[PDB]
Every structure is written in C-alpha cells, then in structure tokens.
Inverse folding.
C-alpha cells in the first residue's frame, strides 16, 4: 500500500534498527516478557542478514553496520513520536 | 534555484523555488506534488533541525540553491477555538494530541494559564488526559473556552 | 533470558502497542517497505488478540483497549529514546 | 514515611526514607533490592518531570510519604582507557554515546586537549562521530590513547 518508492527498503532497515534499540532499552527494565524477549532476538538476527544483503548492493561509502543503523532509527523515531523534525537531535 | 524536500522514506521532491515565496507557498507546492494537504505537513531544515517560520520568506532563513528541507506528514487537522471574548482562533492539532497540550497551546496563544478553564466540544466538557479523536472533531469545527 | 516479574506481559502489551503506532506513523511517509507493512498488520492482529485475552484477566477498573494502550506505548517510547523519565510528560 | 519507585515493567519498590536522606542513598537502597547499580539508574519525579538534584535531601524536593518516583535504567559498562605512560584509568560508558564523548571524558579525567590523540580499540582507529557499540567494547576491555 501507500505509494512507497525505492529506498523505502533502506529506511525500513533503519527504522527497524531503532525499533530493536527500543526493545533493548525496554528489556533493561526487566519489563520485556519472555515471548517478547525471543521476539527481540529474532528481530536482531533477521535484521543483521537483511543488512548484509543490503549493504553489499550499495556503495561502500553508504554501507552501515547494524549499530550505526540504530542511531538513524532512533532519530526517525524521535521525529515520528514528537511529530517534529526538530526532534531528530535538536528537540528534547 | 533548486530546493530538495526529503521525506523519511528517502523520497526527494525538487521544488525549484528561487523567488521570495513564503512557506505557505512551499507546503502548497509540495502538497500538489504528493497529494498531502498543506495542513498535514511539518517542515524543518535538514541540519538546522529548526522548524521554519511562517511569516518569513525562505530566502531569509538561509535557504539557498541546493538546500535541504525535511518533510514529516502528520494525519492531523485544523480547527477553531473561541475564547470568552467571543473571537475565534485557528489551531492545527493532532488527533492523538491530547486536550492537555491544546489547552497549554491556547494558553500562550491567547495569554492565560491552563489551570482555570474547561474546554468543550458540542457542549461536552473535555477531559485533560483524553485525546481529541475521543471527541470526534472534524475539519474546521469549533471548540469552546469555558472560563 | 532476562528475569521479569509480573506485569511484564502487560507492559509488553503496551510497549508493542506503541511500536505499532510508530509503524503506522512511519508508513504515512510512504516509507514502510512491503514486507514491513505486512509486519505492521501481523503485529496489529496478534496484539488485539493478546489484548482481549489479557484484558479478560484484569479488573474492569484497569481494562484498556488497543488505542488507549498505544498511547502509553508512546509515553514509554519517549522515555526510552531520550532515556529521561522527564519526556513522559509535556517535554 | 514511605516512597514508591515505579518502573516500566510495573515493578514498584517501596523505599522508606525518614530524615535527611539523599538521592544517592535512594539509588543505593533500590540498587540492593533490584541488582542494578546506582549509576545505571536515572530517577525522576513522577509528574513534576524535574530530574532530582543529587547532594540535596529528597525531602526538600517535595518528596513525602505517598509520593512516587519513576526509575529508568540505563545500561552501561565499565572500561579502561590507558594513557601514554601506560596507566589504565576506569570509565563508565554508554554504548550509544559517541566516542567524542569518551574522548571528552578522558580529556578532563587526565587534563589534556582533545585535539591531540587518536582513540583506538583492537588497534582499530575510532571515528569521533560513530558510537562505541560500533567497536564492540565489553566489560573491563581496554581502549588506547594515541597522541
């Protein structure tokens, strides 16, 4: 659905990268239940394979590890949640 | 010149705008290009992350040939709320924005604190924690300031 | 595993509700790829069945629908992203 | 009196403070009762949203029998960076934080400017803009300072 173009795959990699960082932080509060903890780890592994297949078909100058993809993920999450583009790294 | 509006999914929308057009004209432009109404659009600089000022031409806000603008779409709406003196005032809000921030919004918008008044829709008092979809607001409708 | 106490099932309900609302807001930007959109839909269904089965075993005084769980979901997401409890409320 | 500490998974810890008790003491009590060290703990007033001040008794910050405090746990690990003379010095670092920030921590920890050195792990240079997780630091692992 919608009108999604190319490069939505890259932005979904990144978006989910931040979803995972969110589950991680959540779990630190001993608040992620057991099925959800396995949901977290399944997310991590299938994300890492999506990232290596993706990075290979991209410029090495734009080839990013999971851990840098998760910084972009948190940034687009903070802009969605505060519906401010001014929250990417300027809104607090 | 040529300005690129980039959206979260990688789309870029190259508004050729030299001019001295305001941001209403920019939101209008892009709104024609991707079928999203001006009111559903928040905008900011790509690196300056500051949300653009309306009254000012974009040439003043240091936008130049090849600048970059971030576009976020928020399925929200426009409404009026009118005060004790009877004058209406427009407000765009998020359906999931809760009446609490709409209150605090008309606070400095008008010039009062938040701790005094009800706020009502269709003679229905609105409850501070509850969001606005609760109270079935549509395009352009009207909310009441209850002293 | 990590050891979680009671109420982790509930707070996981709410957390994944906010996760859903994040997606939804995401795909409005025509940014959710096709497998991910379907990930959105599977998440929503599996969440509502979790919400009714869970809500049956809770007091009517604390029985919340999906759309009101998603709002707590956002409130816990903002504290997680900014690692501040001071972002739960008007911050 | 007695004060409630709530966490995102519905835990609530009931810490009783009486006299002049300090937030350091609070963090320590909750640390014993939950096996999470006091530094990995960020606490804030339930709704007053003001993050509490350290050296001051909680009873000044309007905390009282019945109040509620929210605890969010931030995870970090302890590492060592060693200097040109060879002395490891510890540091508590967050994996998402940037290197620059560790770099800025080693500056004032060892009184130097940050314009002077590399900062390397597994003899791999560490780029100021990347986060530390990129390099997979672990508990008690050792980062190098290269003038």
């Amino acid at each position: 659905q919608i009108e999604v173009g190319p490069g939505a795959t890259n932005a979904t990699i990144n978006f989910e990268a931040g979803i995972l960082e969110c589950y991680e932080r959540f779990s630190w509060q001993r608040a992620l239940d057991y099925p959800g903890q396995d949901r977290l780890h399944r997310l991590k592994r299938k994300l890492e394979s999506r990232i290596k297949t993706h990075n290979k078909s991209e410029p090495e100058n734009k080839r990013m590890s999971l851990e840098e993809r998760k910084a972009i993920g948190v940034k687009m999450m903070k802009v969605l949640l505060f519906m401010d583009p001014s929250a990417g790294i300027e809104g607090f | 010149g040529d300005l690129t509006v980039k959206m979260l999914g990688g789309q870029e929308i190259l508004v050729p705008l030299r001019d001295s057009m305001t941001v209403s004209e920019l939101k209008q432009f892009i709104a024609q290009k991707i079928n999203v109404p001006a009111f559903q659009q928040r905008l900011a600089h790509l690196d300056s992350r500051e949300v653009l000022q309306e009254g000012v031409p974009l040439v003043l806000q240091g936008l130049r040939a090849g600048s970059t603008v971030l576009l976020v779409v928020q399925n929200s709406i426009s409404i009026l709320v009118r005060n004790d003196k009877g004058r209406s005032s427009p407000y765009e809000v998020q359906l999931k924005q809760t009446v609490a921030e709409l209150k605090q919004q008309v606070c400095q918008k008008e010039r009062v604190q938040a701790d005094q008044f009800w706020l009502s829709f269709e003679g229905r008092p609105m409850d501070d924690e509850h969001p606005l979809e609760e109270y079935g607001l549509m395009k352009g409708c009207t909310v009441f300031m209850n002293l």
Notes: Chain A touches chain B at residues 3-8, 10-11, 76, 79-80, 83-91 (CB under 8 Å). The longest helix of chain A spans residues 34-56.
